Design a protein around this nucleic acid. Structure first.
Ligand code: HEM
Ligand SMILES: CC(=O)N[C@@H]1[C@@H](O)[C@H](O)[C@@H](CO)O[C@H]1O
Ligand SMILES: CC(=O)N[C@@H]1[C@@H](O)[C@H](O)[C@@H](CO)O[C@H]1O
Lengths: 79, 107, 98, 94, 466, 104, 96, 80, 108, 94
DNA sequence: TCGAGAATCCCGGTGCCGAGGCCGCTCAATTGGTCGTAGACAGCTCTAGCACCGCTTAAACGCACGTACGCGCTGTCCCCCGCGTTTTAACCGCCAAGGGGATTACTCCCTAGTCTCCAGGCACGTGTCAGATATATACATCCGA
DNA sequence: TCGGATGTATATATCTGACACGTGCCTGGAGACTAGGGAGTAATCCCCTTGGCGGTTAAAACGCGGGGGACAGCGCGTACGTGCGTTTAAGCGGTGCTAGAGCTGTCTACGACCAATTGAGCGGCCTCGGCACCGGGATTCTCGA
């Protein structure tokens, strides 16, 4: 399952344009994919631990909210 | 007995002083909670809510809209120094980002 | 045969995607990536739709902030092109890869 | 079908005080509820720590006032303090 | 060419014309007297006309000491070396001081009561004798300065008269600043406008303009919408005291005998602390004793205060409602629906539309008192904008700001941060029971009144010089 | 202006050292907008009858007060959160800051 | 005899990264701390441990900020640290 | 009353040497003094607030530790 | 009755289980505190202390010193990845910094 | 002088268990005590939040295990968890 | 500074689904009284923070010089950008299933609370042995000859 | 690339002050019950999560021409490090003082807890209009000379 390539080069370009990036080097996409993979791994691991404690098989939006809060990344709009 | 008067009306607030007292009592904060602590907390929460609601409503009105969406709340929060400092590690879902382009990137 | 200069469509996209609020990553590939990553921790997991959207909003906000810091790093080096070393420097000063 | 309590009517009442014509959406309602919960928890935790530092078993308006002073940045805090003070005064009047 | 008796619109007089079917005046030839404000540079056809602010823009207690050298010199006590303010040599309020009388060619304080023959009260402003309550506040501040100078002399015998007077003037100005910016302004602009327009103090910026705007003189008139219909006096028991516990306000304007020969200022201050103001509603803009019954005795007809305000805005050449909305990032209405949305009222919007014709034609005073009040404030968003911006320019542009370094010592600053208007009232009147904190917010006895022996007095011990 | 001073002057003089005359008493007002007179510089809106403002006639101030401001006095609503202290301090603060003189 | 530039600088780097002693005179730091705290309270008294803890925290914070500043200077193909590297480090850290 | 100048240039250079810096610019010192003043202002304000809540006249080291922990800058070796 | 055996002696730990329970009950954390939370928390605290002390003793031995000073604790913390991650926002008084010199600054 | 308690004796016992020939100073003792206090506070707070999120009114060893998993990074956590579990197991045996 | 082509702004109908108003009712907030333990107040004790005083003296300060580095300019090319065509799958709209989230009833076992007591741990007092402090040595290491 | 030339880790004494230890006692943890309510365990309902089909078409991808900017020379000015001699408070060690932190005793008053009552708010159900939607007309931001 090589789903990390699902985040295409135009998608990373759009995220950079929202961030104010005008020119992008060709090797940026792999680095951005690695950074996104690391961040998602951390947040999803925390959220899966939160789900595991609740003895649930479904990751709820509250689990993600608490996982983000534990990292100083509070998210509003989902509880 | 006399007619019941809610504590929020006694304090002149809209946020529930009774429910705030209940939350402080079962919130695992201290053994005892004073009679003026819930009133103070409710007043502070109502003040902060009024601040953000006023700013978000102004943002929506300048956007020529009748309702408030998360974009307006994000614009309200991020355009205020004190509110941005308070909500500095806070993400507002579906709120986008503030438009900002670096000077040297312009033609 | 009208052709813009190589530094105009990028600025137009910058202005276009900074005024919008939509999610800039396709939802199906992002959901597949999230499920593939979560397969490392638990198997046969289920995700609420709200959970996947929350993860997507958080990830997009994080990547936008990281790209702003990376732009500052690249500008500090008297550049305009975003290079990987700028990403590494931003993550190191932020305390992420430090 | 549970009676899920939230600060929906209270934020709506404050909104009608501020913007009667302007309404609010579901996502903005969720964001306002999340913000209210977050600030309540912040102030309550700071007040609990202040009470524990001084070996006090109770949380009073003094602990809440000092927590507001510590957490809320700049003039925000000052304004919040004023509001709280006034409320308690009114609550003492009747 | 006297506006009080002539109705021809000839400079410098520009009056108000009576429309047909007027409730009070049944004559079309009759007009409401009006005066045009003094131009800054008369006789110049190129420079745009503008007005002059006769008092220093800063919050330096200019109502107690004045803003001119002869007036400030005449307000002092030159018969000794204690640095006191000139006081009354003929009457006293149960042994307490009163403002000295002033000699005016046209003294209107004698017009209210021809038997008392009590003149007006002299102070840092000409209009100090406007009402008995304003006179009461002036007496309070003069007494406070005198008592402070006496206490400083007792604490520091080495200080001379001039140093004592200057120090007491500094402390009184700091007291006015603290009261205004800690109690009044939050109750005017509300928390939101006060926070947005008057943020945390940083330092004295010398490039910030400290001048008073021309709009402020017609946007701070929002207080004309809280003038209660009657003047109230209370006794020591805070009960309606006879004779005349409630007086029609048309009979109390410009009357100083009600202060001199009615037990001083104690009942008047007691009524001030224990009488609620008039709420501003979109249907009740101003009471009829100021809209129709203003200044009966001093002139030949009652005056229309709202009409005076709008006419002054027209004469000052202030831009309409739409432009002042365009300053503050607020939408500018153009049609009846937009005005109904902005003003939160449909009938009021229709009446304004019929009267004026465009939202751009609306006067600043009528527009400001028209839109609903801000939350926890008594002004609309545009008035809150104007007042907050003006007060921020006044504060940040003051080098001698009480919080600015080099004006008061740090110990002196902590001594100053403990003052309150009820404390001044107690230290300078016979009133024993005084209102609680935020005297501007307490109106009902004995719900929000306390025995004021518990309020700590000002500590001048930090002012000792060795 | 003196190089050093410990107290404010009577006229607010020398508070701003780069611009002494700015901020003092008996000084002209500042304008956040250019003045919009009837003719632009000399005539107030409504000085000359029949001269429309921006294309529409100038309303009579007394008529505006009669139709909009006027209300039956008996329907007065007291302010339950403020007292006459608020009114009096407002008038005192006015007497402190601003006062526009008019001819006698 | 003389040493070429950059030699005794490296010697100082080696010698001072070894010792753990505070690199600020204690009396001027006490004076600075009291001067700062005067603006918040009157007649404030300070324990010796209070000022010592303030000094330790301040020195650690400054050293860490200087490490970040050196990294920023290295990024721009340079050897000397400049105030703009300090500002960039503070911005990316989030203190600004 | 200008005690921020008590942080001498040799002290700042020693701090930078401990920070692995080989070469320094001449405008670094004032920037360092300003940053130090800001940090000390924040920490001391929080510590004085903690002291005031206890109705004490002296500022203990535990108040400083609490202030630093509030800024997310936990300090070990002083207090508990 | 019987001899008062400390709960930590039964658990085989060097940290006080009873004192940990007392601080859990009086800490305003929950209405109730279980009988396994004190033992778990004491075990975790003792393990972390043992690890950091072992590394600090190694650092002291490498510096031919008998006593442990804060420098040894700082060297122990900053030479371990997990301890540096856990104590990333922690300042150790009189601990100094790790000796590092950028390769660009080295002579060449 | 009233008693003031600290983990100093237990820290010294652990050190003697680890390095019998190596001593400790007093500043290092203060550092160790502060470290123990800080880790205790972190784990206890996380356990309290976990108990609150689940509408529960008891802090148990499951909450403490989840707190250790959330706070301690990587390999440390694993070992720590094992240690914790072992302790509880022994306290269940006797 | 002006045509061509393109991106965005901004009007006008459309209907649609989401926000707002209304109706029951129930569980939580209010009203009325007691208990007693926490906190406010007053008083006494004795650390320890505070303010000079005198002597070294380590270090801060200021200067002369030159070498290494920051700054800027020049040239290459190749890597990035924008457009045209084609393909690939994201997306929307049912269709169906079913696994798990959420709710409800019983109980029983684990935790709070109370009483006694005794031993771990805190504060005290001490001496002796690692450690900072001199001193000369043998290295450790840098700069033109 | 050696002679000295500066710096320093190291081997050998030398006080010294602080840490490891012995001791008294005291107060908090341990043992032993009892009472009650929180959650552990089933059990049911539905809802919302997953898999699938199919048509649209929006977007991703491949290719290609070209231009601009990233990076490697190259030089010049300057400012920062290095060494030296003068000055200045840092540090230290004693000295005395009293402000306030800390402990103790009284007392009262305020919040926890309980029982009775009712209404505020929350969920479910219409309903209409704010707005995202589809043409379509201006409006212009830009590029190539
Ligand atoms: C309570 C009785 C009051 C009376 C009788 C009164 C009367 C007046 C009058 C007659 C004028 C001049 C009208 C004109 O322009 O021709 C005036 C001006 C003004 N009023 Fe009032 N007023 C009162 C209260 C207040 C209050 C409470 C405020 C503010 C809170 C206020 C603010 C002002 C201001 C700012 C001016 C402009 C100064 C000037 O034009 O000289 N007034 N007042
Ligand atoms: C005009 C004036 O102020 N006169 C006063 C006088 O009333 C007072 O009795 C005297 C006492 O020294 O001081 C002077
Ligand atoms: C109605 C009225 O004003 N009456 C007054 C009276 O109060 C006063 O006592 C008398 C003498 O001054 O003059 C008259």
């Amino acid at each position: 399952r090589d789903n990390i390539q699902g985040i295409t080069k135009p998608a990373i370009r759009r995220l950079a344009r929202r961030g104010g990036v005008k020119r992008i080097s060709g090797l940026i996409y792999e680095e951005t994919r690695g950074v996104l993979k690391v961040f998602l791994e951390n947040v999803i691991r925390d959220a899966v631990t939160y789900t595991e404690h609740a003895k649930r098989k479904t990751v709820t939006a509250m689990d993600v909210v608490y996982a983000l809060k534990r990292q100083g990344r509070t998210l509003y709009g989902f509880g | 007995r006399a007619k019941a008067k809610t504590r929020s009306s006694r304090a002149g607030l809209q946020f529930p002083v009774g429910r705030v007292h209940r939350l402080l009592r079962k919130g695992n904060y201290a053994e005892r909670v004073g009679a003026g602590a819930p009133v103070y907390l409710a007043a502070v929460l109502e003040y902060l809510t009024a601040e953000i609601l006023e700013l978000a409503g102004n943002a929506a009105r300048d956007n020529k809209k009748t309702r408030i969406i998360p974009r307006h709340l994000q614009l309200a929060v991020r355009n205020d120094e004190e509110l941005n400092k308070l909500l500095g590690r806070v993400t507002i879902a579906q709120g986008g980002v503030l438009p900002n382009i670096q000077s040297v990137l312009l033609p | 045969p009208h052709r813009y200069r190589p530094g105009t469509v990028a600025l137009r996209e910058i202005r276009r995607y900074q005024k919008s609020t939509e999610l800039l990553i396709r939802k199906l590939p992002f959901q597949r990536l999230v499920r593939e990553i979560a397969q490392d921790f638990k198997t046969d997991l289920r995700f609420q739709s709200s959970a996947v959207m929350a993860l997507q909003e958080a990830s997009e906000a994080y990547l936008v902030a990281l790209f702003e810091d990376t732009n500052l790093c690249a500008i500090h080096a008297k550049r305009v092109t975003i290079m990987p070393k700028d990403i590494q420097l931003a993550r190191r000063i932020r305390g992420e890869r430090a | 079908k549970t009676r899920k309590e939230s600060y929906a009517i209270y934020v709506y009442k404050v909104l009608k005080q501020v913007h009667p014509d302007t309404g609010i959406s579901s996502k903005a309602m969720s964001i306002m509820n999340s913000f209210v919960n977050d600030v309540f928890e912040r102030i309550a935790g700071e007040a609990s720590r202040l009470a524990h530092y001084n070996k006090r078993s109770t949380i009073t308006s003094r602990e809440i006032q000092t927590a507001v002073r510590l957490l809320l940045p700049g003039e925000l805090a000052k304004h919040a303090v004023s509001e709280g003070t006034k409320a308690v005064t009114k609550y003492t009047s009747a | 060419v006297n506006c009080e008796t002539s109705c021809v619109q000839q400079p410098p007089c520009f009056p108000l014309k009576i429309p047909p079917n007027d409730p009070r005046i049944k004559n079309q030839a009759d007009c409401i007297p009006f005066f045009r404000s003094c131009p800054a540079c008369p006789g110049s056809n190129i420079t745009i006309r503008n007005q002059i602010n006769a008092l220093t823009s800063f919050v330096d207690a200019s109502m107690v000491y004045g803003s001119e050298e002869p007036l400030a010199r005449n307000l002092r006590n030159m018969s000794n070396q204690l640095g006191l303010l000139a006081v009354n040599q003929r009457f006293q309020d149960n042994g307490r001081a009163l403002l000295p009388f002033d000699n005016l060619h046209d003294d209107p304080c004698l017009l209210t009561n021809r038997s008392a023959r009590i003149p007006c009260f002299l102070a840092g402003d000409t209009r100090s004798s406007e009402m008995p309550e304003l006179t009461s506040m002036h007496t309070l501040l003069l007494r406070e300065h005198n008592r402070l100078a006496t206490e400083l002399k007792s604490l520091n015998p080495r200080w001379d008269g001039e140093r004592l007077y200057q120090e007491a003037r500094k402390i009184v100005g700091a007291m006015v600043q603290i009261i205004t910016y800690r109690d009044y302004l939050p109750l005017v602009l509300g928390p939101t406008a006060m926070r947005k327009y008057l943020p945390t103090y940083r330092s004295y910026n010398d490039s910030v303009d400290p001048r008073i705007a021309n709009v402020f003189t017609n946007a701070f008139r929002y207080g004309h919408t809280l003038i209660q219909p009657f003047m109230f006096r209370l006794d020591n028991r805070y009960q309606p005291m006879e004779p005349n516990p409630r007086v029609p306000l048309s009979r109390v304007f410009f009357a100083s005998w009600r202060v001199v020969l009615e037990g001083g200022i104690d009942p008047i201050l007691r009524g001030l602390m224990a009488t609620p103001a008039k709420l501003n509603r979109q249907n009740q803009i101003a009471v009829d004793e100021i809209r129709e019954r203003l200044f009966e005795q001093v002139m030949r007809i009652g005056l229309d205060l709202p009409a005076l305000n709008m006419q002054r805005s027209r004469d000052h050449g202030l831009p309409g409602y739409n432009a002042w909305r365009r300053f503050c990032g607020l939408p500018q209405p153009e049609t009846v629906g937009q005005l109904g949305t902005v003003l939160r009222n449909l009938k009021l919007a229709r009446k304004l539309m019929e009267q004026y014709g465009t939202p751009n034609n609306i006067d600043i005073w009528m527009g400001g008192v028209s839109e609903p009040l801000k939350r926890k404030g008594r002004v609309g968003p545009l008035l809150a904008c104007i007042i907050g911006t003006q007060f921020r320019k006044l504060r940040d542009g003051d080098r001698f700001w009480w919080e600015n370094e080099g004006v008061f010592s740090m110990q002196q600053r902590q001594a100053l941060a403990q003052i309150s208007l009820p404390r001044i009232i107690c230290d300078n009147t016979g009133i024993t029971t005084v209102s609680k904190n935020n005297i501007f917010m307490s109106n009902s006895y004995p719900r929000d009144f306390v025995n004021c022996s518990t309020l700590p007095a000002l500590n001048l011990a930090s002012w000792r010089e060795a | 202006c003196p190089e050093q001073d410990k107290y404010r002057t009577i006229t607010g003089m020398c508070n701003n050292r780069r611009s002494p005359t700015l901020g003092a008493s008996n000084r002209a007002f500042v304008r956040w907008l250019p003045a919009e007179y009837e003719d632009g510089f000399s005539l107030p809106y409504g000085w000359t009858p029949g001269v429309k403002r921006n294309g529409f006639p100038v309303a009579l101030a007394r008529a505006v007060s009669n139709e909009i401001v006027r209300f039956p006095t008996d329907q007065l609503t007291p302010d339950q959160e403020r007292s006459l202290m608020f009114m009096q301090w407002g008038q005192l603060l006015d007497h402190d800051l601003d006062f526009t003189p008019e001819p006698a």
